[PDB]
């Protein structure tokens, strides 16, 4: 078994952590336990602090916008913590953070070619330093900065099969035009193809020219007066004409991936430890009647079906895109 | 960099003087310590020495080992006296907070 | 990254214990896998992480890690385990395999 450690630039501080990814079960969130190793001659007249913060970034330079929480701990022991105490020695001081079950998940917005610095999004950072007191300034040389993450995984029990149907009645047409669609399942993994089963029965006197199917991502940012952004991730267009007084039925397959959407600004990707390549953002699982906390971006996916009648008929099929639990 | 010296073969009663020079780092105030690892076992702590001279030893090496620290030449010495077969291990050097890269230590074998 | 594998050949009866060591040149973390290749066939995965057994592999195969010294151990050699074993690391993009260890009878 291994542990993660990071050292201070001056070589008088070290932070030990069990893991970097802390799963977010809906009932409770995995605690952030650890321990700090400090030089014997460094605490002569000082005290050692540990700070964990969660921030939402939407600015490039502080015009820059950031709003954050600071959780402050100044140093029952768990099994890992007592093992670390046994291994390191007496001069290791343990800390534990129990972050709330409701809190933004690690999501980083995709940076454009012009953006520099830290990528916009939500991230967690564990910081530990030794200072004479609070008011003393702490340089980047005398503190340890480490980045952790909060993640969720696919639910054990899949939900009901998505389905959505609609009817549009045209002006000069007595009978209406009927559309139906249905996904294969609800919970889809990353890279797994989505098979939309489109079945349209036209009884009107107007034909249908093209059928457009697209998978869209709804990044809901609650800080900007609940502004909602939707960007397509996969598009499949076919010239499937259905003549009047006739029935059509076909099955279309799509698969959202990142190799095609690199040029899109403001995409939602899973959290990054640093400048790195990460997949598309997984859907956020929310508790029943969950309050809209200000920090965080809520992402959900929906499949759209559209007929371009020679005036358009469309439906939306929500689904869930998450990683399987390991 | 971090490379050690002083390893060798001794009987039960001999003495060695382990040493190492660190380059790219300065320990004018950092507390430097010597670590040992018995074969097939996890690494332990053996001795320590702050810049002020306050030195602490592990209980199994008390009254025998003595850690010297040459700040001017940037070197830490461990001197071992009255060895026993239990002291067979490979010895490393690092900071007290285990901040530097570990590197490859020197081997001590006692008959 | 060099991945030196020892021994290059063993000789163990049926019902004995064998151990194959594979030492990485630099730190490779716990990203090491093991494969088994009977002559004429394609390699089969045995242990994907440092010591995590792959589905379908019997319970006698096991793995371990101590620094940069990964070891694959067979607790009992039934006569269907005489083949060639390779150690692979997959942390860095120039993925390198082990030299190759053969088991005789």
């Amino acid at each position: 078994t291994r542990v993660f450690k990071k050292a201070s630039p001056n070589g008088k501080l070290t932070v030990y952590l069990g893991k970097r990814d802390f799963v977010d079960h809906i009932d409770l969130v995995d605690p952030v336990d650890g321990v700090v190793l400090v030089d014997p001659e460094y605490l002569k007249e000082r005290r050692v602090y540990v700070t964990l913060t969660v921030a939402f970034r939407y600015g490039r330079e502080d015009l820059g916008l950031t709003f954050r929480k600071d959780l402050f701990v100044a140093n029952p022991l768990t099994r890992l913590q007592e093992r670390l105490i046994k291994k390191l020695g007496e001069h290791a001081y343990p800390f534990t953070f129990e972050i709330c079950p409701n809190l933004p998940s690690s999501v980083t917005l995709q940076p454009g070619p012009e953006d520099t610095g830290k990528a916009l999004g939500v991230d967690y950072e564990v910081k530990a330093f030794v200072a004479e007191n609070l008011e003393e300034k702490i340089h980047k040389r005398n503190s340890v900065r480490l980045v952790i993450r909060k993640v969720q995984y696919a639910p054990e029990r899949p939900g009901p099969q998505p389905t959505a149907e609609t009817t549009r009645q045209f002006l000069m047409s007595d009978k209406p035009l009927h559309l139906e669609a249905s996904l294969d399942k609800e919970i889809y993994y990353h890279g797994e193809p989505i098979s939309v089963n489109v079945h349209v029965t036209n009884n009107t006197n107007k034909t249908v020219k093209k059928i457009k199917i697209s998978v869209r991502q709804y990044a809901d940012i609650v800080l900007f007066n609940t502004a909602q952004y939707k960007v397509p991730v996969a598009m499949e267009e076919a010239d499937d004409t259905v003549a009047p007084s006739s029935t059509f039925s076909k099955v279309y397959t799509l698969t959202p991936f990142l190799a095609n959407n690199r040029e899109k600004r403001g995409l939602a990707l899973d959290g990054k430890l640093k400048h790195e390549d990460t997949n598309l953002a997984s859907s956020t699982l929310l508790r029943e009647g969950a309050n809209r906390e200000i920090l965080g971006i809520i992402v959900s996916y929906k499949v759209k079906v559209k007929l371009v009648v020679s005036s358009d008929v469309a439906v939306e099929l929500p689904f869930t895109l998450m990683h399987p639990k390991p | 960099q971090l490379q050690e010296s002083g390893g060798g073969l001794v009987q039960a009663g001999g003495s060695l003087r382990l040493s190492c020079v660190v380059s790219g780092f300065f320990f004018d105030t950092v507390t430097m310590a010597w670590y040992r690892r018995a074969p097939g076992k996890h690494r332990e702590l053996v001795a320590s020495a702050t810049a002020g001279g306050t030195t602490t030893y592990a209980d199994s090496v008390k009254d025998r080992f003595t850690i010297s620290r040459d700040n001017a030449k940037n070197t830490v010495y461990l001197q071992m006296n009255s060895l026993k077969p239990e002291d067979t291990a490979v010895y490393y050097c690092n900071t007290f907070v285990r901040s530097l890269s570990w590197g490859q230590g020197t081997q001590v074998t006692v008959s | 990254i060099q991945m030196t594998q020892s021994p290059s050949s063993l000789s163990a009866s049926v019902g004995d214990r064998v151990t194959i060591t594979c030492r990485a040149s630099q730190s490779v973390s716990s990203a090491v896998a093991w494969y088994q290749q009977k002559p004429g066939k394609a390699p089969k995965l045995l242990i994907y992480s440092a010591s995590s057994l792959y589905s379908g592999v019997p319970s006698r195969f096991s793995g371990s890690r101590s620094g940069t010294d990964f070891t694959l151990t067979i607790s009992s050699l039934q006569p269907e385990d005489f083949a060639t074993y390779y150690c692979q690391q997959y942390k860095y993009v120039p993925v390198t395999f082990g030299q190759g260890t053969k088991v005789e009878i």
Partner: peptide, 14 residues
């Protein structure tokens, strides 16, 4: 001087 590199270290079985 910038930050250090995030490393790892062993841990006893129990």
């Amino acid at each position: 001087d910038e930050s250090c590199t995030t490393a790892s270290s062993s841990l006893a079985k129990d």
